[PDB]
C-alpha cells in the first residue's frame, strides 16, 4: 500500500521528462508524501491510548483521580469520526480528468496513424524530377495566389534564388 502509493509516483517522474515545469503535481506528490510520512510516524509513536489500571494506576496509592481520568478517557473513547465529505467535488476533478485525457488520447491515437500515413504518403509520392509547377498551382491555390499580387504591388525583383542555385553566369 505505502510502497504501492508511490510506485505510480515513479511513473509520473518518467512522465515528467516530456512535461517540464509542473507547478503542483510534484507538490501534490510532495503533499501526498508529506502527510503520508506523518502517518507512519504517527502510528508507530501511538501507544495504546489507555491508562494501565493494572500497573500504571496501582503504582499510585493515592489514586483519587485515575478512575475519573480512566472514565474521562472512556467517555471520550469515541473521539471523532472520519470526514469522508468529498463525494461530489473530488470526482468533479476526475470528470475533468476523463474529459481532457480522452480528448488527448483520441487526438494522439488519430494523429499517430494519420501522421504515419503521411510518412507512407511521402516515401512513394516523391516527384522530385517529374513534378509539375501547374500541379503545384493545383495542390495550393496560394502558390497561384502569391504570384499575381506580387506583380501588381510592384515587387518585381524576386530574391531567394542565388542561395540554392547559382545564377549560372557565363564565365
Amino acid at each position: 500500500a505505502k510502497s504501492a502509493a508511490n510506485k505510480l509516483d515513479w511513473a509520473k517522474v518518467i512522465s515528467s521528462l516530456r512535461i517540464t515545469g509542473s507547478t503542483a503535481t510534484q507538490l501534490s506528490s510532495f503533499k501526498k508524501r508529506n502527510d503520508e510520512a506523518r502517518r507512519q510516524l504517527l502510528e508507530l509513536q501511538s501507544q495504546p491510548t489507555e491508562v494501565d489500571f493494572s500497573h500504571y494506576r496501582s503504582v499510585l496509592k493515592n489514586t483519587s483521580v485515575i478512575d475519573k481520568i480512566e472514565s474521562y478517557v472512556k467517555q471520550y473513547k469515541p473521539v471523532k469520526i472520519d470526514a469522508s465529505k468529498q463525494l461530489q467535488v473530488i470526482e468533479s476533478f476526475e470528470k475533468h480528468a476523463m474529459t481532457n485525457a480522452k480528448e488527448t488520447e483520441s487526438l494522439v491515437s488519430k494523429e499517430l496513424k494519420d501522421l504515419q500515413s503521411t510518412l507512407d504518403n511521402i516515401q512513394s509520392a516523391r516527384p522530385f524530377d517529374e513534378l509539375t509547377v501547374d500541379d503545384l498551382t493545383k495542390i495550393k491555390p496560394e502558390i497561384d495566389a502569391k504570384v499575381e499580387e506580387m506583380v501588381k504591388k510592384g515587387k518585381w525583383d524576386v530574391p531567394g534564388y542565388k542561395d540554392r542555385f547559382g545564377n549560372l553566369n557565363v564565365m
Binding site: K2, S3, N6, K7, W10, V13
Partner: protein, 83 residues
C-alpha cells in the same frame, strides 16, 4: 568524508549502512554538490525504506549480500542516481 558525517543521538543500523556506502562506489561524484550530500543520503535511505523494503530486510536477516542481492542493490543505487 562529507558522507561519513553523522549527528549525535541518531544511531543507525547496518541494513541502511550498506546502501549509503555502496552508493559510494557506483556514483558518488555525481552527488548534488557537497553541502547537499546529507539530504542525499537521507533521501537515499527514504527511497530504500519506501518501495525497496525487500532489500533492507533481506540484507538485515541474512546479514550478507548474495549475487542477485548485489544485482538488485546496484540496480536500486543506479535508479536513484538517475533520479
Amino acid at each position: 568524508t562529507q558522507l561519513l558525517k553523522q549527528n549525535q543521538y541518531s544511531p543507525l543500523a547496518t541494513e541502511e549502512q550498506v546502501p549509503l556506502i555502496y552508493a559510494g562506489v557506483n556514483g558518488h561524484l555525481d552527488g548534488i554538490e557537497l553541502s547537499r550530500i546529507g539530504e542525499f543520503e537521507s533521501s537515499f535511505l527514504s527511497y530504500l525504506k519506501s518501495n525497496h523494503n525487500e532489500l533492507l530486510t533481506e540484507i538485515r536477516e541474512k546479514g550478507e549480500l548474495s549475487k542477485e542481492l548485489l544485482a538488485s542493490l546496484k540496480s536500486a543505487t543506479e535508479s536513484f542516481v538517475a533520479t
